[PDB]
Amino acid sequence: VRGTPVRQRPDLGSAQKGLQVDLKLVIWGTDVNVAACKENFQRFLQRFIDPLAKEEENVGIDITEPLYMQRLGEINVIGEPFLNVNCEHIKSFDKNLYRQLISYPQEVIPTFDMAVNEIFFDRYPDSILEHQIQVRPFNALKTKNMRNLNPEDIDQLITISGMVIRTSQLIPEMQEAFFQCQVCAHTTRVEMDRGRIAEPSVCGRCHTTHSMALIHNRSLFSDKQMIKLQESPEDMPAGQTPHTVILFAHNDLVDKVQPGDRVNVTGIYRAVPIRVNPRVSNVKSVYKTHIDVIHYRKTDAKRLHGL
Amino acid sequence: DLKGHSVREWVSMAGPRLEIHHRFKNFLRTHVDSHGHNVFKERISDMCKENRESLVVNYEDLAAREHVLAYFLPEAPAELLQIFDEAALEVVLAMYPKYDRITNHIHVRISHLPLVEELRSLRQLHLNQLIRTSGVVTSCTGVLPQLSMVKYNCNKCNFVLGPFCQSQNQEVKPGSCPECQSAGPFEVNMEETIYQNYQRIRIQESPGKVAAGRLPRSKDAILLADLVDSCKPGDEIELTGIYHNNYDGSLNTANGFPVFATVILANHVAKK
Ligand SMILES: [Zn+2]
Ligand SMILES: [Zn+2]
């Protein structure tokens, strides 16, 4: 790494401890090794040429060179740091890595990010991207019906397809709060950490207690977008009405897709509790769920090209 | 300079605070000696050699070289003493910046105050003034620990309410906890507090100085943090201190004239 910024991944989810345990040294709760997943995906990057790459349907994709390496070349010639990692390419290559990614996305994906940034900066020393490349894993094995999803896929990358209904206005949310001491004008940035800020409560310079006030419009904000979407399931049981699902997009995917657009959506299925009343801080046993979004596939084999 | 306002309010103003602090620093550095030695250098050298925590200066030298401070001294002694604490701290840190761990404080004592009052005659006209006096210690309790920068556990949430300075007048009382916002039953954190030695003596007029038909009169006195156990019972002692009335001593109770006790915050004890 040269020193390019590590901008946080709002769409993947809030951070966690990343607790590791020996049975070599897997992540707690998961059958994942950071080293194993990282190395397997580095192999996948460096040596995965297609068995077939129809140039007509996949313009810019050859059958000779390793697949994603020329993608890194184009991500060097232009400045957008995003790499389209086809989950079915991963399925053909390494079924184990498919299982680990589409069971443990928010932790396998940062390792994939680390590997991609490492390989890219090894290849191109003087190339300058605004921040680290990010891997967009999509085309996971299509779940047909949200109403036939189970409570076992929470935080587990799924895919469905359907038409948007609304794309509401942006909503900033905090990522790095700004504090200033009311007395001595001492500043400090406080990173948002695992879902909640840490109000400093003591000036670092003059030690006054709770003189630290939160300056709003000096902070850091990533964006958001509620995107109410109507599912087009391929499985329609006998009386399941048209299911509709909320999509929260974030800094890079917001306002990339308008109402009425028809999209496959691959994203993190995310349960979040429901507050009992808008002001009381209790919650409900009966959670809601909403798909996040890690990727929209615009292309459809049945429809024609979009605008 | 002088104006219509009182001496105490004057020295409370920030402008003359900087003025007289600068003057004290100036003569601390520059009043060389009677015979060109820079005695303050050697006195500070010995002071930090022992870590005495307390310097003493001669009032004759003080007044002679710089007389405005000397005139101000008995009028509003408390403020002048606090500033000279700060200025002496500045100069000792300048000479030995390593002193920072050593007590974070230096007291200053004033010797040879010219006008000695007698314990028979200490009237209303000496309240809140630094006087010099003589006597014999009739009693001297043991050294007790006093709060000086006290921290309180808010025992609703165990936040450490910060270090409050403790004046001698009224016991410090926190308003509320900055965290849970309660005026709760706070209680002192025994450890983070930094206490201070407190000893209580009682001097009385010597029979060699009492008159014909009389009973010798006795004044209390408080020694703090360096002068404790600097005098035992029966010692003929000169005492210099702020004759003092406004702490909590007053006969506001029933069956009593509105009559106030008094003490002497001793600023220098000298055996003889
Ligand atoms: Zn401050
Ligand atoms: Zn509290």
From Swiss-Prot, chain A:
**Could you provide one GO biological process annotation from this protein's UniProt record?**
double-strand break repair via break-induced replication
Q: How is it modified after translation?
A: Sumoylated; SUMO2 modified in response to stress caused by inhibition of proteasome activity (in vitro).
Keyword tags: Acetylation, ATP-binding, Cell cycle, Chromosome, DNA replication, DNA-binding, Helicase, Hydrolase, Isopeptide bond, Nucleotide-binding, Nucleus, Phosphoprotein, Ubl conjugation
Location(s) in or outside the cell: Nucleus; Chromosome
**Sites of the modification Phosphoserine?**
14
Task: List GO terms (cellular component aspect).
Answer: chromosome, telomeric region; CMG complex; MCM complex; membrane; nucleoplasm; nucleus
Q: Which residues carry this modification: N6-acetyllysine?
A: 95
Which disease is given in the protein's UniProt record? Immunodeficiency 54: An autosomal recessive disorder characterized by severe intra- and extrauterine growth retardation, microcephaly, decreased numbers of natural killer cells, and recurrent viral infections, most often affecting the respiratory tract and leading to respiratory failure. Affected individuals also have adrenal insufficiency requiring corticosteroid replacement therapy and may have an increased susceptibility to cancer.
Put simply, this protein is called: DNA replication licensing factor MCM4
Q: Which residues of the full protein are shown?
A: 107 to 432 of 863
From Swiss-Prot, chain B:
Reported modifications of this chain? Phosphorylation by the CDC7-DBF4 complex during G1/S phase is required for the initiation of DNA replication.
In the record, which positions carry Phosphoserine? 206
The annotated crosslink position for Glycyl lysine isopeptide (Lys-Gly) (interchain with G-Cter in SUMO2) is 3
Subcellular localization(s) per the UniProt record: Nucleus; Chromosome
Superkingdom is Eukaryota
Q: N6-acetyllysine occurs at which residues?
A: 41
Zn finger (C4-type) ranges are 154-180
Any other comment in the entry? Early fractionation of eukaryotic MCM proteins yielded a variety of dimeric, trimeric and tetrameric complexes with unclear biological significance. Specifically a MCM467 subcomplex is shown to have in vitro helicase activity which is inhibited by the MCM2 subunit. The MCM2-7 hexamer is the proposed physiological active complex.
What is the role of this chain? Acts as a component of the MCM2-7 complex (MCM complex) which is the replicative helicase essential for 'once per cell cycle' DNA replication initiation and elongation in eukaryotic cells. Core component of CDC45-MCM-GINS (CMG) helicase, the molecular machine that unwinds template DNA during replication, and around which the replisome is built.
Subunit structure, interactors included: Component of the MCM2-7 complex. The complex forms a toroidal hexameric ring with the proposed subunit order MCM2-MCM6-MCM4-MCM7-MCM3-MCM5. Component of the CMG helicase complex, a hexameric ring of related MCM2-7 subunits stabilized by CDC45 and the tetrameric GINS complex. Interacts with DBF4. Interacts with KAT7. May interact with MCM10. Component of the replisome complex composed of at least DONSON, MCM2, MCM7, PCNA and TICRR. Forms a co-chaperone complex with DNAJC9 and histone H3.3-H4 heterodimers.
Q: Which family does it belong to?
A: Belongs to the MCM family.
What pathology does the entry list? Deafness, autosomal dominant, 70: A form of non-syndromic sensorineural hearing loss. Sensorineural deafness results from damage to the neural receptors of the inner ear, the nerve pathways to the brain, or the area of the brain that receives sound information. DFNA70 is characterized by slowly progressive, postlingual hearing impairment.
Q: What is this protein called?
A: DNA replication licensing factor MCM2
Q: Which organism is it from?
A: Homo sapiens
Lineage here is: Eukaryota, Metazoa, Chordata, Craniata, Vertebrata
Portion of the full sequence shown:
176 to 447 of 904
